[PDB]
Amino acid sequence: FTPVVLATPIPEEVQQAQTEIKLFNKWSFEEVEVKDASLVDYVQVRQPIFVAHTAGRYANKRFRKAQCPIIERLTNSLMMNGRNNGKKLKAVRIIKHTLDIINVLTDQNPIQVVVDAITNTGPREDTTRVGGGGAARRQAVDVSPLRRVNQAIALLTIGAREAAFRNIKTIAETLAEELINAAKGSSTSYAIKKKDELERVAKSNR
Amino acid sequence: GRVRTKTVKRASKALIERYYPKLTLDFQTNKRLCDEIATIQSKRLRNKIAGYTTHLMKRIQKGPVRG
Amino acid sequence: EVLVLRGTLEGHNGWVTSLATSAGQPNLLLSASRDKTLISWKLTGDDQKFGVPVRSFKGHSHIVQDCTLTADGAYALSASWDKTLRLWDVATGETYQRFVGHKSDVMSVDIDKKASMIISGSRDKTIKVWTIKGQCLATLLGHNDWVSQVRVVPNEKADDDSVTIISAGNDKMVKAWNLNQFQIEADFIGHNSNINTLTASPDGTLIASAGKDGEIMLWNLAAKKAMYTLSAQDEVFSLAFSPNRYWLAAATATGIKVFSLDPQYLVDDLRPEFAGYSKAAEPHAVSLAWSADGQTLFAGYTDNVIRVWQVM
Amino acid sequence: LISKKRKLVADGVFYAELNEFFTRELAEEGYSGVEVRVTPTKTEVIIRATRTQDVLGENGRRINELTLLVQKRFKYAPGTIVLYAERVQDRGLSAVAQAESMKFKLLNGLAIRRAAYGVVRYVMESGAKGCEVVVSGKLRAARAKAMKFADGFLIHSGQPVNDFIDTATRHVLMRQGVLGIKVKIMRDPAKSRTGPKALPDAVTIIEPKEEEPILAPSVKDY
Amino acid sequence: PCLESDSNDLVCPCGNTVVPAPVRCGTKLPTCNHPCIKVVRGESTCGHKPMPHTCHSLDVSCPPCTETVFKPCKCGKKTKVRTVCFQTDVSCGIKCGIPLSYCYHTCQKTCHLPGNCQKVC
Amino acid sequence: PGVSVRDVAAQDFINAYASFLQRQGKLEVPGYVDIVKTSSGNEMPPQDAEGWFYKRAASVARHIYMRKQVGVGKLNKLYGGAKSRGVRPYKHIDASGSINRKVLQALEKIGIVEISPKGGRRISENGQRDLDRIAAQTLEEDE
Amino acid sequence: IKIRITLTSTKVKQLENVSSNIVKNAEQHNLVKKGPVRLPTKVLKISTRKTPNGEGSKTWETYEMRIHKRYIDLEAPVQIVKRITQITIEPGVDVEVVVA
Amino acid sequence: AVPSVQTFGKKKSATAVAHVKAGKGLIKVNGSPITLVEPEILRFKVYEPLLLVGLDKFSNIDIRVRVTGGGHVSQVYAIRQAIAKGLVAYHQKYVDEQSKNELKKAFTSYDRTLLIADSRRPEPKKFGGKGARSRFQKSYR
RNA sequence: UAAUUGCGAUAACGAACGAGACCUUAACCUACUAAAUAGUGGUGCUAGCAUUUGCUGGUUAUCCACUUCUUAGAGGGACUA
Ligand SMILES: [Mg+2]
Ligand SMILES: [Mg+2]
Ligand SMILES: [Mg+2]
Ligand SMILES: [Mg+2]
Ligand SMILES: [Mg+2]
Ligand SMILES: [Zn+2]
Ligand SMILES: [Zn+2]
Ligand SMILES: [Zn+2]
Ligand SMILES: [Zn+2]
Ligand SMILES: [Zn+2]
Ligand SMILES: [Zn+2]
């Protein structure tokens, strides 16, 4: 590599960024694989981004949110419970800190930890309400992979937000151990426990 | 939906009935001749009429059309 | 000898409406398209690439209908559906002159040899003739439907007596004008449909005019009498004479029919392969132009490409 | 020394007040409207009515008193305001004139159906595309109801309503209460001469002139 | 305006238009709308008359002659090929196809400039 | 190559110039400093008690450097913030005029700004040169 | 001479034809002029409840009056100045001419 | 004179006007270098027009951008669009069509909003509710 | 089909209103006409930092040029190609 000198000088690390696009100029999207063959084509990690803020239109068509990058989908789900509606700058800062904490706590690629958490906590079977003759009965059904990704993200971020509320731990830290425990399947994760409970209820209601 | 009303359909059929060899299978030329060969009060209505006319010319090129 | 497909040129996203070449620069090709632009290409004479775009000319606000080059290739002219003409510096883009005054879509432009003055036939049933500086020196009326093409007749002798132009419109009537004094001299009757195109031979004695009925009608304007008609059996959009051989190429809706005239028979009748479009309709050539040496035939199609053919 | 917004709103309210004054006093003269033209040193008020001789009076005496009235009220200098009377054309195509004539017929004692059919026949005879007159109120009974009388065709929605329908409303003060008169007139778009000559959805295809096939190539020379 | 005045008339190449002395400093002679003196002579190597163009300064390039003339090609398989007068590049358009010495194959470059056959096959 | 205030990030430039003014020590800090809040929309005084006037001075000096001419009302709007009106909704409230007027006068006395035609205060040439020198030093500190 | 003509109507077509015949009279008299500067159209809005009383669905209604303003700068002698201010009288078009 | 082009980029109400002229490589936004654009979490969003094609494209030209209107993030998006469109327009006018097409292809393959403005516009608010779609709360008793 | 919107079928045929068309507004135009009440570039005058030449500014009577950005008028553009 050779640096190039401009009249407005450009720092060496962002000049390094010309060779490869990395998340926050730190995390390579290469060598990240989705372990679940069902959740590949619905977890999007093939297109790299510098920042988890793309003003993209994924709501017009039925399946464009699958082509939305998965880090920005996690970021979007962080902007919840009314007071934080909007505030994507706060959400992307939280995501950046979360990835740093993940890499510190385990030497793995934090994007790989995120996709492992999503693949591990997508609920594989669920149940739906039927008529049942005036009383609610629940009939076990299967879950489509897009719904598995959506509900995995919702469970992970809801667990992080609930465990960060009224706590000295920050939201980035709480999301970091939430994603780490879900990636291990450690059952100390909120999302792992919720996924297990839903699958158990569906198995009972077969 | 993109269903075209009877004003467009009837104008297109009348245009084809009395101007078939003059007009073509191309929307741009059909538009450019329709605006001078008919009196249509709206550019939008002229575009819709010329488009349905071009569609019917494709239909006519693929065998005859009833009506 | 036979024509063989050599390569394609890809820079447009609309129908390639016209092609122009220059004797001065045998490696230049100018193409005007439906994407409101012109492209000047540099030819390489090699494998599948065969040529690269070196300049785009932008500034027309609608479909640019045709284009011509001067003999040296320094200046280009474009006629467009925005009711204007434009003169471009081929080296630097750079519109020198805007010609305004037509009241409808100008469909044909042609510089005369010697770069003296410009004719343009439009959709308001007029043929306006202009100076280089951009003033309408005259307008020609009396042509009852809208004009499809105008062309200049090349003088075999070096400026023998005068300069004449020919024109075809949609009133099934082609015309020949002496614009030394702005009169009509020849009025050829005989077409039965909208005439799309007409071409004068490099000899200056043959006129080929053709349109939607598929009848390529030949005229000898030296004697001012009709000679015969060829049949393409389908709509034909462009005609061009080979500058050295006795060949006439016609861009029909199904192929490009090229005819030699000394036995008067069809020689090749080339049809390219598209790998697609089979359900509705194959794209067809809407423009074609020979080279200055008559060895390569360029053809601009409706699938926004230009295909080239080389003779053996 | 006034802003343009306030000036244009002020002369709008001046037009509205002047029109209300003229329709209050010139009701029995067939008052059909008013127009205002400002001019350096003079503003002119064109009254469009039917009985211009009654609007004028002897040597324009009523015109002089109307100029003096509008002058005294609107604080104009002497000579700065001038009124002209003008006989309106196409009296059948004037909803205000037809509504006032129907009001005076009902006040004089004509039957409601006879008056309404007279006005709709007059408007249809005057070349309108359609007419519609509605009479609402206590008609022959204490319970109120509405009667509709139509002829021709009238449209109701879109920009052609502003273009072609003229409407007017009047209050008739009968001894049992108030009747309401509504008059809608759709004029022929072809006779407009100012604006669109047709409805938006009207498409006219011109007839192609037929020419004989020539079947023979020939050359004309000069 | 500058005090200095040229005592010499400004002369166009034709000489038809001159600026009478005294000429104010910085005055620009207007070139003749009349044709170029060379055009009036009609002299040209092509033997035709140059295109009739307005008079211009000698430093400015003269517009060239443009007459379709038939010239022999670089390969020369063809004696006459239609080209403009100014153009020196005439093309028969036919590959010379001369068996290369070094290779079994021939040289396909068309209109080979004499002595310019391809070096690599 | 030459620098200016626009070549340096706002926060660290303002910190460097405020520290420079505090070390120079001729700004005539008014005296009701440590009493006041800087805005009617504030509820607590500035936490950096012994400073904050040099911070406001560096901020208004850089602001006038970037602009053409700035007055006290523009400064009050610039430094005013959202007031919490108890149980009613929040609202924009202008900052204290006395603080901004006195810091403008203090900068005039040390020669950074001056009275401009068309009103307000514009930066003087001495203010331009020493703000530029501070920019040079704070861009050199990282080397 | 520095005169400026300001036209401030609500009728776009009458405004535009007044501007057009002023500018063609100016070029016919060969007067140097700054062309018709068209100011932003100012829209006067009034929003009201439709109902005269106060019941039913709360339906609102916005009325608007559009004011179109143009001005032309002219450098012409005084006789053409009076002839300009004596010609181009249009109903509904408010015209004013100012000097210096 | 000096070869130069002017372009613009847009996002909502933010407009950025970029002057791209022949020069030595300075990229300035509102008179300050590109390395000081205000949300530093979004600084790479205006870096990425430079990074996708390489800085050798910017070595021989210099770009000055003035942005107004809108808010912080929309001004960032307008800046990046103006810079990318300015580079493409310069390569259109003074460099060849091959280079212009390669630049356009790289920008389009990464992000369509680098060259084509996002067409999403605000929907007007309607009466009877706080927003365009949302309505006031309905009660029945 | 959003639509008695259409394809059609058919003791009905031909019509009218409503729907649609329409009109206002928001999106595009490096195409036209322009702008000292919108801007931009250059030249004057001038400040600071640098040092050949540069960078950031100030000043409109200091003049010139232009219309990309801005404002309109006139048009173009989509018709599901
Ligand atoms: Mg907490
Ligand atoms: Mg604050
Ligand atoms: Mg709040
Ligand atoms: Mg809202
Ligand atoms: Mg200056
Ligand atoms: Zn001369
Ligand atoms: Zn010469
Ligand atoms: Zn010659
Ligand atoms: Zn040869
Ligand atoms: Zn050879
Ligand atoms: Zn070989």
Side-chain angles (χ1 to χ4, degrees), chain A residues 1-17 19-206, chain B, chain C residues 1-155 158 163-278 280-312, chain D, chain E, chain F, chain G, chain H:
Chain A
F1 173 78
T2 175
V4 59
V5 185
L6 302 174
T8 290
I10 300 292
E12 191 66 40
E13 51 267 20
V14 54
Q15 286 211 10
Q16 279 315 284
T19 65
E20 185 186 339
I21 302 175
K22 294 203 261 223
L23 191 47
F24 305 109
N25 208 17
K26 205 172 183 181
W27 317 122
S28 174
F29 284 86
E30 291 146 7
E31 277 194 41
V32 170
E33 281 76 4
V34 179
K35 309 304 173 194
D36 208 341
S38 66
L39 290 198
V40 74
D41 291 331
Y42 283 101
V43 176
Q44 213 274 129
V45 291
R46 274 300 71 71
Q47 270 82 50
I49 44 172
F50 293 111
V51 186
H53 187 288
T54 71
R57 308 153 74 159
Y58 305 102
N60 302 133
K61 293 284 139 283
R62 190 185 177 194
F63 277 88
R64 284 221 81 221
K65 65 169 75 164
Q67 293 323 339
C68 182
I70 199 64
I71 301 301
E72 191 170 1
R73 286 171 53 77
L74 204 62
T75 302
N76 285 340
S77 179
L78 277 180
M79 317 188 319
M80 291 215 168
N81 273 15
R83 47 170 181 173
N84 315 302
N85 275 346
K87 309 198 181 177
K88 200 164 171 170
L89 305 185
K90 180 179 297 317
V92 298
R93 183 71 70 180
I94 290 158
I95 284 294
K96 178 180 169 299
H97 293 339
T98 302
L99 298 177
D100 271 348
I101 298 173
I102 284 173
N103 189 65
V104 165
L105 277 169
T106 53
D107 304 350
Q108 294 179 356
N109 196 327
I111 313 180
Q112 185 72 66
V113 180
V114 166
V115 304
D116 292 348
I118 296 164
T119 52
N120 281 10
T121 194
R124 284 159 309 162
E125 69 174 359
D126 209 0
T127 186
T128 180
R129 264 191 51 250
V130 295
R137 295 215 322 143
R138 295 178 65 88
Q139 170 62 45
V141 291
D142 292 331
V143 188
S144 77
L146 178 67
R147 194 184 204 270
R148 302 221 284 118
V149 175
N150 297 1
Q151 184 177 2
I153 295 177
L155 285 171
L156 287 157
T157 51
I158 283 172
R161 165 182 316 114
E162 281 174 350
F165 186 76
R166 289 197 211 112
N167 198 0
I168 186 70
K169 299 175 59 72
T170 67
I171 179 62
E173 295 171 354
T174 303
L175 186 59
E177 291 84 4
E178 170 84 13
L179 290 169
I180 285 168
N181 288 343
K184 304 195 310 290
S186 178
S187 171
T188 62
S189 170
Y190 171 97
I192 292 290
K193 285 176 299 192
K194 288 287 179 179
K195 190 259 291 182
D196 282 17
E197 180 68 29
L198 262 66
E199 284 179 349
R200 188 191 63 71
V201 164
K203 196 169 73 67
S204 296
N205 298 21
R206 281 177 194 168
Chain B
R2 295 312 227 279
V3 179
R4 317 179 184 86
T5 66
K6 64 183 180 292
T7 66
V8 186
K9 292 210 194 303
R10 280 208 277 258
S12 307
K13 293 187 211 95
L15 273 184
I16 287 158
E17 271 186 330
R18 60 210 59 175
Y19 282 104
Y20 174 78
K22 186 150 290 300
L23 60 85
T24 63
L25 275 77
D26 168 70
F27 164 74
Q28 307 292 328
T29 54
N30 279 6
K31 167 183 67 175
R32 286 315 204 218
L33 62 85
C34 169
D35 61 358
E36 62 86 10
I37 195 66
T39 300
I40 307 168
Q41 316 299 304
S42 192
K43 180 206 291 181
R44 210 189 153 201
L45 186 54
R46 175 214 68 194
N47 288 359
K48 291 183 178 301
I49 287 167
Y52 198 58
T53 306
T54 311
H55 167 72
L56 288 183
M57 301 295 297
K58 281 158 177 227
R59 294 263 317 279
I60 284 172
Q61 282 273 130
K62 273 86 176 175
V65 186
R66 327 161 49 211
Chain C
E1 71 275 60
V2 71
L3 282 85
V4 60
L5 190 142
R6 187 56 51 98
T8 66
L9 312 181
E10 293 179 353
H12 284 128
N13 45 356
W15 293 6
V16 181
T17 71
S18 77
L19 307 162
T21 187
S22 168
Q25 314 198 18
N27 290 317
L28 195 68
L29 173 68
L30 181 76
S31 48
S33 174
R34 271 202 171 186
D35 53 7
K36 298 183 289 294
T37 54
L38 295 93
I39 299 290
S40 77
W41 313 74
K42 187 204 77 185
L43 277 296
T44 55
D46 66 330
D47 44 11
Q48 66 274 346
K49 198 56 64 160
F50 200 76
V52 293
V54 301
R55 195 146 286 258
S56 68
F57 304 88
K58 314 190 302 179
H60 275 308
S61 85
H62 208 274
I63 294 159
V64 63
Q65 193 39 63
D66 61 333
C67 65
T68 61
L69 264 177
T70 55
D72 56 356
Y75 283 20
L77 284 172
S78 65
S80 172
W81 289 28
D82 62 352
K83 316 191 292 295
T84 60
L85 310 161
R86 262 175 194 252
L87 168 70
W88 312 81
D89 192 0
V90 181
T92 59
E94 162 56 10
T95 296
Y96 283 173
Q97 192 45 60
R98 271 183 77 256
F99 310 89
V100 301
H102 272 159
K103 286 187 309 304
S104 180
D105 295 332
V106 60
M107 310 295 288
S108 195
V109 71
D110 208 350
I111 190 66
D112 72 323
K113 194 64 67 179
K114 285 179 174 54
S116 174
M117 70 166 177
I118 297 145
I119 62 170
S120 56
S122 55
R123 252 173 190 154
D124 59 356
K125 302 178 285 183
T126 59
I127 305 169
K128 282 191 173 301
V129 64
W130 317 82
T131 66
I132 308 298
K133 299 304 297 213
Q135 73 153 330
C136 180
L137 71 83
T139 183
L140 304 179
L141 300 155
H143 188 192
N144 310 279
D145 200 357
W146 61 87
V147 183
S148 70
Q149 286 185 357
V150 294
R151 288 288 174 272
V152 298
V153 191
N155 287 24
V163 65
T164 58
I165 62 175
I166 48 177
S167 76
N170 287 350
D171 57 354
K172 312 156 297 307
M173 186 64 72
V174 298
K175 289 192 174 58
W177 311 69
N178 194 3
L179 81 173
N180 288 68
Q181 73 292 350
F182 313 150
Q183 300 322 301
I184 194 184
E185 270 78 4
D187 199 307
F188 310 90
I189 298 89
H191 265 282
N192 291 274
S193 183
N194 290 341
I195 308 158
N196 283 342
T197 175
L198 76 166
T199 313
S201 179
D203 292 331
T205 47
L206 276 291
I207 293 173
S209 78
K212 187 140 44 178
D213 46 350
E215 294 294 328
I216 314 173
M217 302 195 38
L218 272 300
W219 323 81
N220 177 33
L221 74 163
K224 271 166 288 183
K225 64 90 176 179
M227 294 182 286
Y228 53 110
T229 63
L230 283 77
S231 175
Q233 292 85 19
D234 62 357
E235 186 169 3
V236 57
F237 300 97
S238 180
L239 303 155
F241 281 109
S242 180
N244 50 342
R245 264 161 261 191
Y246 270 91
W247 288 8
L248 171 66
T252 70
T254 57
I256 296 169
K257 289 191 165 48
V258 62
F259 317 99
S260 55
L261 271 74
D262 63 88
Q264 313 274 340
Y265 79 110
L266 176 71
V267 289
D268 186 74
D269 185 28
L270 60 83
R271 274 141 160 90
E273 321 286 329
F274 299 105
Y277 305 91
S278 161
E282 302 305 354
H284 55 84
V286 286
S287 47
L288 60 84
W290 291 103
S291 293
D293 55 355
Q295 295 292 128
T296 66
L297 176 58
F298 317 107
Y301 279 63
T302 54
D303 59 347
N304 65 8
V305 303
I306 303 163
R307 290 183 183 85
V308 310
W309 275 272
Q310 302 223 249
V311 306
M312 295 298 102
Chain D
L1 207 42
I2 191 171
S3 84
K4 286 314 166 52
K5 312 183 180 186
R6 299 171 39 195
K7 199 195 148 284
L8 291 201
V9 172
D11 67 23
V13 305
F14 161 71
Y15 168 78
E17 177 170 351
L18 199 70
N19 178 78
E20 207 274 333
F21 173 57
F22 278 150
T23 195
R24 273 209 186 276
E25 69 196 338
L26 291 184
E28 64 268 8
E29 278 77 19
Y31 167 77
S32 187
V34 74
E35 201 259 335
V36 289
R37 297 188 73 243
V38 185
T39 303
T41 65
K42 201 148 50 58
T43 175
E44 64 183 1
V45 171
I46 310 296
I47 312 177
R48 298 293 298 273
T50 75
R51 284 181 270 290
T52 55
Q53 70 276 17
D54 291 331
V55 166
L56 279 148
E58 60 87 20
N59 67 31
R61 191 49 47 210
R62 196 168 182 178
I63 285 295
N64 296 115
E65 85 186 27
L66 283 190
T67 53
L68 279 174
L69 272 180
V70 304
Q71 213 184 0
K72 286 307 165 304
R73 184 263 178 273
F74 289 111
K75 279 78 176 176
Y76 275 82
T80 53
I81 182 67
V82 60
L83 265 66
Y84 305 83
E86 182 66 40
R87 194 192 320 276
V88 68
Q89 313 304 312
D90 63 358
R91 181 182 47 181
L93 318 180
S94 180
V96 289
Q98 295 317 297
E100 294 267 36
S101 71
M102 189 144 170
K103 164 173 184 166
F104 284 140
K105 282 163 183 44
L106 290 180
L107 282 183
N108 277 36
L110 206 51
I112 294 169
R113 310 210 191 200
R114 186 174 177 181
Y117 278 136
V119 66
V120 74
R121 273 203 323 272
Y122 183 54
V123 173
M124 281 335 287
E125 173 262 346
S126 312
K129 191 61 60 172
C131 176
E132 208 262 337
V133 54
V134 189
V135 188
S136 302
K138 306 159 59 174
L139 323 171
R140 204 44 184 166
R143 191 71 169 261
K145 67 178 183 179
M147 281 206 248
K148 277 160 141 163
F149 311 87
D151 203 8
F153 310 127
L154 301 100
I155 54 188
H156 298 77
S157 58
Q159 187 52 44
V161 184
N162 318 321
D163 283 328
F164 303 118
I165 296 89
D166 203 57
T167 179
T169 304
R170 285 303 178 273
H171 291 56
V172 190
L173 277 77
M174 315 289 257
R175 69 180 179 92
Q176 72 271 16
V178 182
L179 305 187
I181 299 300
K182 264 169 202 156
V183 171
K184 302 158 66 80
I185 297 170
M186 192 195 148
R187 48 180 201 83
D188 199 335
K191 267 86 74 176
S192 66
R193 310 161 277 100
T194 61
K197 311 294 178 293
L199 285 181
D201 43 353
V203 178
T204 298
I205 317 295
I206 71 152
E207 273 313 313
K209 294 282 301 163
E210 183 67 29
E211 58 95 25
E212 61 86 20
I214 49 176
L215 73 164
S218 295
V219 182
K220 179 252 180 190
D221 203 318
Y222 182 76
Chain E
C2 182
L3 310 171
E4 311 295 324
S5 60
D6 192 17
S7 62
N8 302 337
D9 290 14
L10 307 178
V11 192
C12 63
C14 300
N16 203 10
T17 298
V18 286
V19 184
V23 186
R24 276 185 171 179
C25 197
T27 297
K28 303 176 181 180
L29 167 71
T31 59
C32 267
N33 297 353
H34 307 258
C36 184
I37 180 175
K38 308 174 183 179
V39 175
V40 178
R41 307 166 204 174
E43 296 173 1
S44 73
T45 62
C46 62
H48 310 112
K49 182 189 179 183
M51 146 199 170
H53 52 261
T54 62
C55 158
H56 57 94
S57 172
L58 301 176
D59 300 348
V60 185
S61 60
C62 300
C65 185
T66 42
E67 302 296 312
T68 58
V69 270
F70 282 71
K71 299 178 180 178
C73 182
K74 303 107 181 175
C75 66
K77 297 181 177 307
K78 195 176 185 183
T79 57
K80 296 186 178 182
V81 191
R82 180 180 276 104
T83 190
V84 269
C85 274
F86 74 91
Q87 248 278 265
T88 62
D89 297 351
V90 244
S91 54
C92 105
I94 320 173
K95 50 179 179 182
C96 86
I98 298 174
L100 300 154
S101 58
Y102 62 98
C103 251
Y104 292 129
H105 316 97
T106 77
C107 37
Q108 294 149 341
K109 300 180 175 173
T110 160
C111 311
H112 245 132
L113 259 167
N116 286 34
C117 298
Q118 66 181 358
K119 310 95 201 175
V120 280
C121 177
Chain F
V3 303
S4 65
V5 182
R6 299 198 156 85
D7 295 333
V8 180
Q11 208 189 13
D12 59 19
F13 176 78
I14 282 172
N15 294 347
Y17 186 57
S19 80
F20 167 74
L21 291 173
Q22 183 154 30
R23 290 185 315 245
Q24 191 193 21
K26 44 163 301 173
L27 199 46
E28 66 182 1
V29 184
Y32 60 85
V33 72
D34 74 0
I35 309 290
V36 295
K37 289 186 303 185
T38 73
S39 177
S40 178
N42 276 24
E43 64 161 66
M44 275 316 267
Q47 290 175 355
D48 193 8
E50 61 266 21
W52 81 257
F53 200 77
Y54 312 98
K55 284 272 161 53
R56 184 57 66 92
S59 177
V60 300
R62 175 207 151 82
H63 206 262
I64 290 155
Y65 184 94
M66 314 274 267
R67 268 87 195 160
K68 300 165 134 47
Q69 63 282 310
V70 193
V72 182
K74 256 73 173 190
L75 288 185
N76 289 346
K77 197 177 180 185
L78 170 80
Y79 294 118
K83 171 162 206 168
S84 180
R85 301 158 58 228
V87 72
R88 310 201 285 290
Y90 284 67
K91 214 213 301 183
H92 162 78
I93 285 300
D94 291 331
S96 178
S98 164
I99 281 163
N100 299 297
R101 177 170 33 85
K102 283 194 183 294
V103 68
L104 279 187
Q105 290 162 347
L107 286 189
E108 269 167 270
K109 214 162 281 293
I110 63 169
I112 302 305
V113 305
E114 65 183 1
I115 298 285
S116 162
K118 324 173 261 193
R121 264 90 162 180
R122 64 161 151 210
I123 189 158
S124 66
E125 65 183 1
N126 265 2
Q128 191 163 3
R129 89 164 72 250
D130 76 331
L131 276 296
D132 284 343
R133 274 201 291 251
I134 289 299
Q137 303 164 40
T138 187
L139 212 63
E140 181 56 340
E141 285 295 327
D142 301 342
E143 278 89 320
Chain G
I1 295 94
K2 299 289 94 175
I3 81 168
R4 178 179 287 173
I5 300 161
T6 304
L7 323 170
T8 183
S9 88
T10 74
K11 293 181 181 180
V12 180
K13 174 152 151 83
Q14 291 85 330
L15 208 56
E16 288 311 339
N17 76 47
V18 160
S19 292
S20 70
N21 64 7
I22 296 169
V23 300
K24 77 181 51 153
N25 189 358
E27 61 77 10
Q28 173 258 328
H29 272 66
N30 294 115
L31 311 166
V32 54
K33 61 160 200 316
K34 304 282 221 63
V37 184
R38 316 181 160 90
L39 300 176
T41 304
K42 59 179 71 67
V43 187
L44 271 51
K45 294 175 223 74
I46 289 173
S47 80
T48 49
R49 284 281 298 275
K50 288 202 180 185
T51 186
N53 49 355
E55 63 87 20
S57 299
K58 319 297 173 52
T59 61
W60 287 81
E61 198 184 31
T62 180
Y63 295 84
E64 52 179 50
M65 178 207 269
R66 290 142 197 217
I67 299 175
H68 303 256
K69 199 166 156 190
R70 275 130 192 81
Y71 68 88
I72 303 167
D73 291 331
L74 269 178
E75 292 166 12
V78 291
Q79 51 270 17
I80 307 95
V81 161
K82 276 75 70 177
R83 87 161 301 176
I84 281 298
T85 193
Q86 278 303 113
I87 194 66
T88 71
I89 289 168
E90 202 66 60
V93 171
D94 186 74
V95 55
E96 65 183 1
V97 56
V98 68
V99 73
Chain H
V2 181
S4 66
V5 290
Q6 320 164 299
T7 57
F8 67 99
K10 276 179 178 178
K11 176 70 150 44
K12 311 202 198 193
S13 282
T15 305
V17 180
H19 302 304
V20 183
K21 63 185 287 292
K24 64 183 181 293
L26 58 92
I27 321 167
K28 295 293 202 65
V29 166
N30 287 324
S32 304
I34 195 68
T35 60
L36 297 179
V37 179
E38 181 65 26
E40 61 265 60
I41 199 68
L42 293 175
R43 193 163 295 158
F44 261 80
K45 187 57 64 175
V46 298
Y47 281 162
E48 47 201 50
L50 314 174
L51 290 185
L52 290 157
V53 299
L55 300 179
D56 62 358
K57 304 304 181 334
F58 298 90
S59 66
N60 276 315
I61 62 170
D62 64 31
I63 310 172
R64 289 164 215 219
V65 192
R66 317 300 300 211
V67 65
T68 44
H72 296 123
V73 63
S74 65
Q75 276 187 1
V76 165
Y77 274 83
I79 287 159
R80 72 196 280 264
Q81 187 177 302
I83 289 173
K85 283 176 62 186
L87 179 79
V88 162
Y90 192 91
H91 271 248
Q92 203 274 320
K93 189 176 200 182
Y94 300 110
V95 184
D96 63 298
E97 271 276 290
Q98 291 254 41
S99 68
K100 194 223 71 183
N101 282 330
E102 298 156 9
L103 294 184
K104 193 180 262 212
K105 184 182 51 213
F107 288 150
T108 300
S109 74
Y110 189 74
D111 199 313
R112 202 169 101 90
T113 49
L114 279 173
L115 298 169
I116 299 296
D118 192 69
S119 56
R120 287 184 297 178
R121 306 303 302 186
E123 188 180 324
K125 169 214 178 305
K126 263 73 72 177
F127 60 92
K130 279 306 184 189
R133 303 289 173 96
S134 68
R135 310 283 91 203
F136 298 139
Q137 181 156 274
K138 184 183 280 189
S139 66
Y140 293 89
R141 285 177 194 92

